[PDB]
mmCIF file of C-alpha atoms in Angstrom:
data_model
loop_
_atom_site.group_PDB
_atom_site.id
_atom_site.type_symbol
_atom_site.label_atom_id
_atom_site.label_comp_id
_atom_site.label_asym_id
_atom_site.label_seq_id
_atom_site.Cartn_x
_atom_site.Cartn_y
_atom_site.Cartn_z
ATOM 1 C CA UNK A 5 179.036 246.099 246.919
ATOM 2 C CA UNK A 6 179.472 246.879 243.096
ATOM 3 C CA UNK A 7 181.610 247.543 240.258
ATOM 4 C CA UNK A 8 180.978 250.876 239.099
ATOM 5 C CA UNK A 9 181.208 251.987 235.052
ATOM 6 C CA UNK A 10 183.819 254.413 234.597
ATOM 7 C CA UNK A 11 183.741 253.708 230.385
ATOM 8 C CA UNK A 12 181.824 251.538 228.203
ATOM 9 C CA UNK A 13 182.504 250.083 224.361
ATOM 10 C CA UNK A 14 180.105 249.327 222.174
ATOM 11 C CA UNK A 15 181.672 245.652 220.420
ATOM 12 C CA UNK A 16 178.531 244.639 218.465
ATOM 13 C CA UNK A 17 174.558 245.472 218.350
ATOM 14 C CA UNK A 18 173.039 242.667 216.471
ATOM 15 C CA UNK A 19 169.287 241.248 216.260
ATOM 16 C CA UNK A 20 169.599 238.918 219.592
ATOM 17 C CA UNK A 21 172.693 240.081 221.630
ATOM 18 C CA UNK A 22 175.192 242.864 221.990
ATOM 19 C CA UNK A 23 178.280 243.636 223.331
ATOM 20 C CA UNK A 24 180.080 245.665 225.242
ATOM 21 C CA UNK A 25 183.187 245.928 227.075
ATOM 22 C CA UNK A 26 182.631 248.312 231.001
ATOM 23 C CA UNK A 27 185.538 249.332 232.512
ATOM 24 C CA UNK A 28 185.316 249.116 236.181
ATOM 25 C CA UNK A 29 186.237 250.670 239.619
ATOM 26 C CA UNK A 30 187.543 247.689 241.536
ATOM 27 C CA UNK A 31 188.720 248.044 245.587
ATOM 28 C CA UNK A 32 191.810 249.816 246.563
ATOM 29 C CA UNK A 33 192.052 252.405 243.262
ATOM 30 C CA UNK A 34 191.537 249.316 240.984
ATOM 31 C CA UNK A 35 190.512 249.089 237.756
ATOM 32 C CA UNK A 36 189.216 246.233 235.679
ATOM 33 C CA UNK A 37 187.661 245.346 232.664
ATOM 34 C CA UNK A 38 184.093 243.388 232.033
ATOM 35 C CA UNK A 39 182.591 241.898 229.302
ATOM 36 C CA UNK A 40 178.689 241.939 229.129
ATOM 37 C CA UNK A 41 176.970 240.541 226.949
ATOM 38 C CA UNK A 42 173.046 242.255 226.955
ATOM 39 C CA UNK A 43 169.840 240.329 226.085
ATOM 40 C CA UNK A 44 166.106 241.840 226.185
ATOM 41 C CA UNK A 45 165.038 238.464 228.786
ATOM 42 C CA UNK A 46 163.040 235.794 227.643
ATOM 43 C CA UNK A 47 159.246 234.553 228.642
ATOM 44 C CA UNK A 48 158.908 230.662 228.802
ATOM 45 C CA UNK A 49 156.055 228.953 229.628
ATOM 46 C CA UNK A 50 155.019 225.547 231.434
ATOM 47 C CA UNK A 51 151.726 224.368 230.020
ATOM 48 C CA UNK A 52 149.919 220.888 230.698
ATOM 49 C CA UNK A 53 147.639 219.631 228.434
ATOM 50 C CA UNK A 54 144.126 218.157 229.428
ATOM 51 C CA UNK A 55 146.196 214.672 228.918
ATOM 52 C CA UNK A 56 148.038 215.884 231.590
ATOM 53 C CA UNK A 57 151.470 216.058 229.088
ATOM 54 C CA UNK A 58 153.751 218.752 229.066
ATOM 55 C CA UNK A 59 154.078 221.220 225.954
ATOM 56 C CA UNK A 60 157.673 221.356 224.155
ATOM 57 C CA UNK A 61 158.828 222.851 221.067
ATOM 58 C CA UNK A 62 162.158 220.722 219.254
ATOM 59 C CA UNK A 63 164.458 223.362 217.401
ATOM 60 C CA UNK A 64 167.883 223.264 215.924
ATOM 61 C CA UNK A 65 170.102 225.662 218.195
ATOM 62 C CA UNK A 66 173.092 227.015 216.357
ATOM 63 C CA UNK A 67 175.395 227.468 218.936
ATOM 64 C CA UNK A 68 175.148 223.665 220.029
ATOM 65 C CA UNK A 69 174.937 222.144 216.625
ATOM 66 C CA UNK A 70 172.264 220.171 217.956
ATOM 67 C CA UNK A 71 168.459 220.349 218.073
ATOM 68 C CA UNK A 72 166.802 220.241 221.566
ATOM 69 C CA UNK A 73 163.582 219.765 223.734
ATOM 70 C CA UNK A 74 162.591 223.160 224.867
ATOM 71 C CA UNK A 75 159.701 224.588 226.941
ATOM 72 C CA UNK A 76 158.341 227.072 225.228
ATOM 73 C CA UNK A 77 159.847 230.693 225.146
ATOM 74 C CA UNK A 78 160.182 234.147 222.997
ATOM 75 C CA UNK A 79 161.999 237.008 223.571
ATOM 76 C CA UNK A 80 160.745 239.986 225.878
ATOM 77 C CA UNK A 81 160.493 243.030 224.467
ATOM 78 C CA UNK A 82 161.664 246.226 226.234
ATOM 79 C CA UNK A 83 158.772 247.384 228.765
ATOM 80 C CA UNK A 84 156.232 244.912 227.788
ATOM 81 C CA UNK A 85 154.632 242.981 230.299
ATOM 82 C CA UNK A 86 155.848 239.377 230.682
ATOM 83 C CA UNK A 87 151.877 237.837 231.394
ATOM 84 C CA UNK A 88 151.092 239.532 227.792
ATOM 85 C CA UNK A 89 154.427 238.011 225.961
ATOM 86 C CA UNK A 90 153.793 234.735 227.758
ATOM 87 C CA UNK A 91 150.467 234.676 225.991
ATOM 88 C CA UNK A 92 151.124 235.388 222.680
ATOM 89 C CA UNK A 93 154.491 232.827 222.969
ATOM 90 C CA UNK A 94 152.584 230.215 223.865
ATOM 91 C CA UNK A 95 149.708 230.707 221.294
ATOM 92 C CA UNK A 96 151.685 231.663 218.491
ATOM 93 C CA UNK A 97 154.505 228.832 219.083
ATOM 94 C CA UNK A 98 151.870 225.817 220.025
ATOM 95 C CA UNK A 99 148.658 226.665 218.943
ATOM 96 C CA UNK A 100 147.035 227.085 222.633
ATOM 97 C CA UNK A 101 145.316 229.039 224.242
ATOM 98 C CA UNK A 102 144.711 229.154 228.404
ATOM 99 C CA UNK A 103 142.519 230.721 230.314
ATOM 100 C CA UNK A 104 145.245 231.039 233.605
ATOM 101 C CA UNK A 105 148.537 232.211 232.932
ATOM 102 C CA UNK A 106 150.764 232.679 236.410
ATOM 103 C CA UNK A 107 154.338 233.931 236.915
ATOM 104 C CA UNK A 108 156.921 230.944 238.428
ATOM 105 C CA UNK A 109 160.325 232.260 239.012
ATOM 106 C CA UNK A 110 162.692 234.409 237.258
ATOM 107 C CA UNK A 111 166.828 233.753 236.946
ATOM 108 C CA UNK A 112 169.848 234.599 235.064
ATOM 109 C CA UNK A 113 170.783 231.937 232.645
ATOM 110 C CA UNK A 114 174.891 232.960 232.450
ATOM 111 C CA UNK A 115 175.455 235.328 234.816
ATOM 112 C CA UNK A 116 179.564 235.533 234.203
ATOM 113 C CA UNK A 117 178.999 237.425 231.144
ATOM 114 C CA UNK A 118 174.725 237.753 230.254
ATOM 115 C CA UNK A 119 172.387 239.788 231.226
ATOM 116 C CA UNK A 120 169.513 237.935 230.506
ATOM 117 C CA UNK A 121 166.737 236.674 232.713
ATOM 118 C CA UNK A 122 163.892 234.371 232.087
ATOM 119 C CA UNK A 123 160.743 234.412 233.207
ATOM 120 C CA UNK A 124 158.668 231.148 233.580
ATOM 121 C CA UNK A 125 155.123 230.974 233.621
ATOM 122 C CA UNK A 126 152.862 228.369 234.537
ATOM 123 C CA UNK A 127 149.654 227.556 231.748
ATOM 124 C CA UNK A 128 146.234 226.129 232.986
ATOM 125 C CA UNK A 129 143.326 225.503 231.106
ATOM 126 C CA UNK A 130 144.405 224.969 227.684
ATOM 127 C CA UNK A 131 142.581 224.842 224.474
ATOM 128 C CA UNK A 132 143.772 224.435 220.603
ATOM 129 C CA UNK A 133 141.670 225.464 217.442
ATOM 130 C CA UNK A 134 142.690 222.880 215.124
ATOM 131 C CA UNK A 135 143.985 225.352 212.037
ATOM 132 C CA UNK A 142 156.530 228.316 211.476
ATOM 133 C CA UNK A 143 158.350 225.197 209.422
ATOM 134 C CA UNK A 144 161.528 224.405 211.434
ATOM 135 C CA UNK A 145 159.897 223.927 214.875
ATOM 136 C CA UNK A 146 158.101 220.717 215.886
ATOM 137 C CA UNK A 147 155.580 220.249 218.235
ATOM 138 C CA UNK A 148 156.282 218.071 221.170
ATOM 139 C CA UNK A 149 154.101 216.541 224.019
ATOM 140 C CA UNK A 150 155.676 214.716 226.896
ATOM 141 C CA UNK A 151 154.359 212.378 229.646
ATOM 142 C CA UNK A 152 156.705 213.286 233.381
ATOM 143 C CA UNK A 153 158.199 209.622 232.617
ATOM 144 C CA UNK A 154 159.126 210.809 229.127
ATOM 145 C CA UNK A 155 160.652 214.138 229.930
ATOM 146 C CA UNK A 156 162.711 211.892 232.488
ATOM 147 C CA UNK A 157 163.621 210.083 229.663
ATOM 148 C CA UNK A 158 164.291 212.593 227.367
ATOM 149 C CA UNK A 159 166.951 214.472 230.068
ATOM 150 C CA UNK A 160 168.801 210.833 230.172
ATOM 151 C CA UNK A 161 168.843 211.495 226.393
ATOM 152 C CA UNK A 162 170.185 215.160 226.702
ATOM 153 C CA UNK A 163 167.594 215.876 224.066
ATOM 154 C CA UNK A 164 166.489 217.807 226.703
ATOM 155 C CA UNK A 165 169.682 219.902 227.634
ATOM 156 C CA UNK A 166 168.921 223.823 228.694
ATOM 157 C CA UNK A 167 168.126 225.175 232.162
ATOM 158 C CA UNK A 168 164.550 226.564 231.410
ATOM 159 C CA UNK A 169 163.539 223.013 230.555
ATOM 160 C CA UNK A 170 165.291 221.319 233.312
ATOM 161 C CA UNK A 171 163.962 223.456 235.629
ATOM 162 C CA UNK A 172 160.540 222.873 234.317
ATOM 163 C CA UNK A 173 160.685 219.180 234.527
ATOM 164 C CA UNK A 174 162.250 219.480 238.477
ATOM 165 C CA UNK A 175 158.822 221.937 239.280
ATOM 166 C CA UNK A 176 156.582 219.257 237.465
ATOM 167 C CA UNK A 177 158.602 216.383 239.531
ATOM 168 C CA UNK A 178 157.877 218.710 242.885
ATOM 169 C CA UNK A 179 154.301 219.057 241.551
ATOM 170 C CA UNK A 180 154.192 215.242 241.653
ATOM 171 C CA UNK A 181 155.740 214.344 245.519
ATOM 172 C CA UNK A 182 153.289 216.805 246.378
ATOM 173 C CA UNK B 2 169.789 215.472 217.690
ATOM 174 C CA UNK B 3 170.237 217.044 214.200
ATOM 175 C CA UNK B 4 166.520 217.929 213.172
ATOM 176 C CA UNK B 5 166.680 221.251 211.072
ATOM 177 C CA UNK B 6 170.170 221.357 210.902
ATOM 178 C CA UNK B 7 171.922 224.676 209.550
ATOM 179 C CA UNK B 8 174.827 224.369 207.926
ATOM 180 C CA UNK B 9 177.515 226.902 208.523
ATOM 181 C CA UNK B 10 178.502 228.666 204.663
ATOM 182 C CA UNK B 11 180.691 231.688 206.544
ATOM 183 C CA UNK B 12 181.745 232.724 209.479
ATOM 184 C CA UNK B 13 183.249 236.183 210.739
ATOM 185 C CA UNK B 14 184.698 237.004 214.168
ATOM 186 C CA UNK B 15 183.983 239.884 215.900
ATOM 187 C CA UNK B 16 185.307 239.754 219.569
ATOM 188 C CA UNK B 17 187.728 237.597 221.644
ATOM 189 C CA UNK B 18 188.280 238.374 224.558
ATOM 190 C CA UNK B 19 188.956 237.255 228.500
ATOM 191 C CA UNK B 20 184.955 235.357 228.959
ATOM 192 C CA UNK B 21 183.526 235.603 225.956
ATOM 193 C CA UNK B 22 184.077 235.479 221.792
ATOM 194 C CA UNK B 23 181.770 236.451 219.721
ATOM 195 C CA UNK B 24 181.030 235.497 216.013
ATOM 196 C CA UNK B 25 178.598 235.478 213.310
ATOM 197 C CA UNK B 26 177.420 232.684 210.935
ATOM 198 C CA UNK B 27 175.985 232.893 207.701
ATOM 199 C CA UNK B 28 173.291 229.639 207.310
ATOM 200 C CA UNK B 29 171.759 227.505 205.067
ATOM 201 C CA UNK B 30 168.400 226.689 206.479
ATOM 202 C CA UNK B 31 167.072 223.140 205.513
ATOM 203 C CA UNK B 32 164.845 225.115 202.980
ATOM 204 C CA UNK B 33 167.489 226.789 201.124
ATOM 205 C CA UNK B 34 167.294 229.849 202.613
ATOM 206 C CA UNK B 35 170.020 231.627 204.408
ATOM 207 C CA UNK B 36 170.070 233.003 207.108
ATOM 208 C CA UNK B 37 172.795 235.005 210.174
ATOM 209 C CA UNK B 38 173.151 233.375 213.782
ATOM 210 C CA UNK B 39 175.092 235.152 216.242
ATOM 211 C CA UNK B 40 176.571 232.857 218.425
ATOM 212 C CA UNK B 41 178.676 233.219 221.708
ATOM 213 C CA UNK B 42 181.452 230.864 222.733
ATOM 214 C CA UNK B 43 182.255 230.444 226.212
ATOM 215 C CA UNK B 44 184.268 227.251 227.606
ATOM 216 C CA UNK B 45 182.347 224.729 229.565
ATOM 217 C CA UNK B 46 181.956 224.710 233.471
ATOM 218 C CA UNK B 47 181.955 222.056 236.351
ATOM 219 C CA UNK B 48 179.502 223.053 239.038
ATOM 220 C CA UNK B 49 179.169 221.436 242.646
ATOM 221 C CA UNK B 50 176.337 220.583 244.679
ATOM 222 C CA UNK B 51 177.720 219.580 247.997
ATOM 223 C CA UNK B 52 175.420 218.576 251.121
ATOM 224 C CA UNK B 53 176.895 219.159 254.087
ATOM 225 C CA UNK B 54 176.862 215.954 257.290
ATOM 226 C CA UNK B 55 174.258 218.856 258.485
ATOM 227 C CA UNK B 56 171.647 218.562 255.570
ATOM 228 C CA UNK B 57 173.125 221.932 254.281
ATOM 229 C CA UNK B 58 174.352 223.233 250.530
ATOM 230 C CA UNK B 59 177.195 224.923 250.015
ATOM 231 C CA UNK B 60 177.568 228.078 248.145
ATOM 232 C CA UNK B 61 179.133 231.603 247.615
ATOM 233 C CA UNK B 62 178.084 234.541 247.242
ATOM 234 C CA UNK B 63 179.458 237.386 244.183
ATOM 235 C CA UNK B 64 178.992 240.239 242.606
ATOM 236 C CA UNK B 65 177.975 239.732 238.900
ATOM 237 C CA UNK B 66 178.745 242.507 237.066
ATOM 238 C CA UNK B 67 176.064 241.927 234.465
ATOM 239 C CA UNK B 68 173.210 242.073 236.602
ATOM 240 C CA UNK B 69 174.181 244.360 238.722
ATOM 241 C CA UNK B 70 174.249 242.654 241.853
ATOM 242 C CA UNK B 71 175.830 240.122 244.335
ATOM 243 C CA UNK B 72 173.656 236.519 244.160
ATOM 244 C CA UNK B 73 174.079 233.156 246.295
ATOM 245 C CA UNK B 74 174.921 230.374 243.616
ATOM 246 C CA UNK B 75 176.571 226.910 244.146
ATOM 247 C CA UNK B 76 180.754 226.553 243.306
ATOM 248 C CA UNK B 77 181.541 226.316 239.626
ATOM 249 C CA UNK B 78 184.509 226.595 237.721
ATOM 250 C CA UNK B 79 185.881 226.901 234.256
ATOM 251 C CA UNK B 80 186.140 223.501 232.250
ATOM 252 C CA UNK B 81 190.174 221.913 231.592
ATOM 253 C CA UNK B 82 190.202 220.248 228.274
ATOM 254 C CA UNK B 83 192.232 217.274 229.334
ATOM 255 C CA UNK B 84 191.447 217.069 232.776
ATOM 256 C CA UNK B 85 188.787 214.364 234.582
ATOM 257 C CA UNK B 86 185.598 216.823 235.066
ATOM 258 C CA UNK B 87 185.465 215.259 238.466
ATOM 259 C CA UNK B 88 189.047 216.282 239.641
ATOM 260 C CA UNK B 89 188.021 219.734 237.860
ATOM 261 C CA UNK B 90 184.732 219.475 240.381
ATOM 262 C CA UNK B 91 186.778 218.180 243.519
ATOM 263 C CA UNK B 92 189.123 221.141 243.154
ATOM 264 C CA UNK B 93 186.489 223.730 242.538
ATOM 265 C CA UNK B 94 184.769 222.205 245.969
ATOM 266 C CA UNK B 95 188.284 223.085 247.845
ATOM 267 C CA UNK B 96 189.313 226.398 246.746
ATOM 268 C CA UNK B 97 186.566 227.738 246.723
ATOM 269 C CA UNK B 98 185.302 226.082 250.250
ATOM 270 C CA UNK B 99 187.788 224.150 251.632
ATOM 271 C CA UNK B 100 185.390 221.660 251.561
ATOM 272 C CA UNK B 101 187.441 217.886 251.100
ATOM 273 C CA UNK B 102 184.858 215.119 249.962
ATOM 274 C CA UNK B 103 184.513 211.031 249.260
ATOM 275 C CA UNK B 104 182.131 210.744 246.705
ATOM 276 C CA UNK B 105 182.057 213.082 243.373
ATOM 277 C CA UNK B 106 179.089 212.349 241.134
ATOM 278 C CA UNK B 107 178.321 213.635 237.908
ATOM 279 C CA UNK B 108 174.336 214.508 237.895
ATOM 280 C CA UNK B 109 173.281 216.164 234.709
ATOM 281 C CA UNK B 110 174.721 218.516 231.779
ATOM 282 C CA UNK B 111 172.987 221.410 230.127
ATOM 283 C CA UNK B 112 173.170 224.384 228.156
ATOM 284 C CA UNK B 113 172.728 227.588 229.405
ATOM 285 C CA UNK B 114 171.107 230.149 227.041
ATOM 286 C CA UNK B 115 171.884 227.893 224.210
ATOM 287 C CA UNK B 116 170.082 230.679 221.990
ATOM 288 C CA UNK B 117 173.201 232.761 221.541
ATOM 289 C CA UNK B 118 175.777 230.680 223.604
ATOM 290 C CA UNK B 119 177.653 227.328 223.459
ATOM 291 C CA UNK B 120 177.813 227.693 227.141
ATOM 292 C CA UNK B 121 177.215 223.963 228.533
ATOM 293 C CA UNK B 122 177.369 223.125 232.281
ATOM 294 C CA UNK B 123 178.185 219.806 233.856
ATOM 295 C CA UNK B 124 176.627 219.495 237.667
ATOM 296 C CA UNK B 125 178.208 216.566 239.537
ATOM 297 C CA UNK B 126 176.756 216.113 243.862
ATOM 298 C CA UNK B 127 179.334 215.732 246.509
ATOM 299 C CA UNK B 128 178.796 213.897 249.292
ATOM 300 C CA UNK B 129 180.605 212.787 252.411
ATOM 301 C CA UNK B 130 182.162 216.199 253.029
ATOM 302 C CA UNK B 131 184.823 217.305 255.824
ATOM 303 C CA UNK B 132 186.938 220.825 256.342
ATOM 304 C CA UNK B 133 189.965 220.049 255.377
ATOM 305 C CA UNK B 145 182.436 237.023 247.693
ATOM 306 C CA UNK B 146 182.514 234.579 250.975
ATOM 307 C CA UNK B 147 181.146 231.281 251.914
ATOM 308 C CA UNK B 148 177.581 230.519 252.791
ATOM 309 C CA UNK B 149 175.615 227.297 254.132
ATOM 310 C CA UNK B 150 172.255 227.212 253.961
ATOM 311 C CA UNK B 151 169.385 224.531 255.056
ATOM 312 C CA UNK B 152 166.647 223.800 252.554
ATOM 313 C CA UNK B 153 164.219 226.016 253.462
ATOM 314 C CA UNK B 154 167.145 228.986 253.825
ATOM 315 C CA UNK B 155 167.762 228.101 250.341
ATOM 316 C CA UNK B 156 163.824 228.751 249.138
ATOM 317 C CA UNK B 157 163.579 231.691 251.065
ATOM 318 C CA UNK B 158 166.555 233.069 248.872
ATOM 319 C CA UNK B 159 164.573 231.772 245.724
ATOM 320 C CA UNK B 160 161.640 234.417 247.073
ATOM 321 C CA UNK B 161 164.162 236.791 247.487
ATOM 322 C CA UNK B 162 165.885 236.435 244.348
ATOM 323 C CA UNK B 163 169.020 235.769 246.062
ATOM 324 C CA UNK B 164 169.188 233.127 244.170
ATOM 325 C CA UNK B 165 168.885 233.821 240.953
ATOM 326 C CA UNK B 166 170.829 231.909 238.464
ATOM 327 C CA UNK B 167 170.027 228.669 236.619
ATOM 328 C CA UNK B 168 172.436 226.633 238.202
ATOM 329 C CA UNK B 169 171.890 227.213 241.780
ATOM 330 C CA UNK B 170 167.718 227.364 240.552
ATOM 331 C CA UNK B 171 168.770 223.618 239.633
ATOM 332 C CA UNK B 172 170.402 222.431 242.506
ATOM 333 C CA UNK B 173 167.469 223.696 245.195
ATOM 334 C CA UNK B 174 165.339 221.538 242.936
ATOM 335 C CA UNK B 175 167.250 218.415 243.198
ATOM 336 C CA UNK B 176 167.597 219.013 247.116
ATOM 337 C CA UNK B 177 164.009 219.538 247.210
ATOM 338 C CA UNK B 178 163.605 216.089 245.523
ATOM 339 C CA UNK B 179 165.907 214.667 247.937
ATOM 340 C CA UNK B 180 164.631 215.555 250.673
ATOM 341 C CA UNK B 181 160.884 215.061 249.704
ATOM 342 C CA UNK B 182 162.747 211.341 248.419
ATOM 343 C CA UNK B 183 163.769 211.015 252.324
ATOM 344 C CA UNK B 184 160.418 210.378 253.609
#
């Protein structure tokens, strides 16, 4: 199955997402319209500390008016290899290091109208030389990022799903 | 919560359409600073994990445009403003499954890519089901083979293997 292009519109190229508008061949001589909204994917990673707590970032997200508990994540860029971004997110936006860095599981976040997928990695080994502004630096016990989902201060997919795999880890 | 807030000083539309609109805000970071955030706004979304008397979950399968491709998620539909959630869940369950049910239980809210968009999605779990882009029951381990395929592929449904998973490792 599929709903082929026949004519694209460019709405809107911006610095995160853009926008376009595909008309499409539907059955029976159809025709229909799509929006699509198209996003380079994301990297986010799961990382436990020697302590044994998870790694989160807390940021104010515009589009919720709200600041959340986030794994965390950076944007992929086009044709770069996730393992790399992975990396260099987690370094750059926590200050560690690992020395094993392994692919989890990829999905779509909105599928009705995004494009973009995220790819979760898992961290191992971490380490931190002791040496930005508007992120703070969060680490969470399993009981506490329980606790923090009652709270809906953690409130996106990539973290929820996180906590679930760490929760599987656990009855395992 | 409200750490790092940024405080909307303009706003200008660019799209509304069927799915999606589309605008951009001009910010004052908590610095001074300004700043643009592009931010999509899509209404909410009731989605339904429903367990079958059979130990299976209920889903559908459709073609999503965006990513090319037809995935397996669970039922969802658009959010009424002014209508119960859970008679927005119980309804979703029967048109799109024919699925009738005794128990409808909200489970957890999140955003989805709450980056760019507002989008927020409220999972409640049905059980105690009876029969009152096609429909699809799959066991547990039918379901995690789709994960491995990337059949499966979306947030949502990502979430709701999880929570079976739990459920079932909870049954023991």
């Amino acid at each position: 199955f599929e709903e082929k292009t026949i004519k694209t519109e460019q709405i809107f190229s911006g610095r995160v997402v853009k926008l376009q508008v595909d008309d499409v061949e539907l059955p029976n001589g159809q025709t229909s319209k799509r929006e699509i909204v198209r996003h380079p994917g994301a990297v986010a990673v799961i990382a436990i500390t020697n302590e044994n707590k998870i790694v989160m970032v807390e940021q104010y997200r515009k589009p919720l008016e709200k600041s959340i508990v986030e794994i965390p994540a950076g944007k992929l860029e086009k044709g770069e290899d996730p393992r790399i971004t992975a990396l260099r997110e987690l370094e750059e936006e926590t200050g560690y290091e690992c020395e094993q860095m392994e692919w989890l599981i990829s999905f779509a976040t909105s599928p009705g109208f995004a494009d973009e997928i995220i790819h979760i990695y898992v961290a191992k080994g971490l380490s931190k030389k002791e040496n930005d502004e508007f992120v703070d630096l969060i680490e969470l016990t399993l009981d506490e990022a329980l606790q923090y989902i009652k709270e809906q201060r953690i409130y996106d997919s990539k973290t929820v799903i996180a906590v679930q795999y760490l929760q599987l880890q656990e009855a395992l």
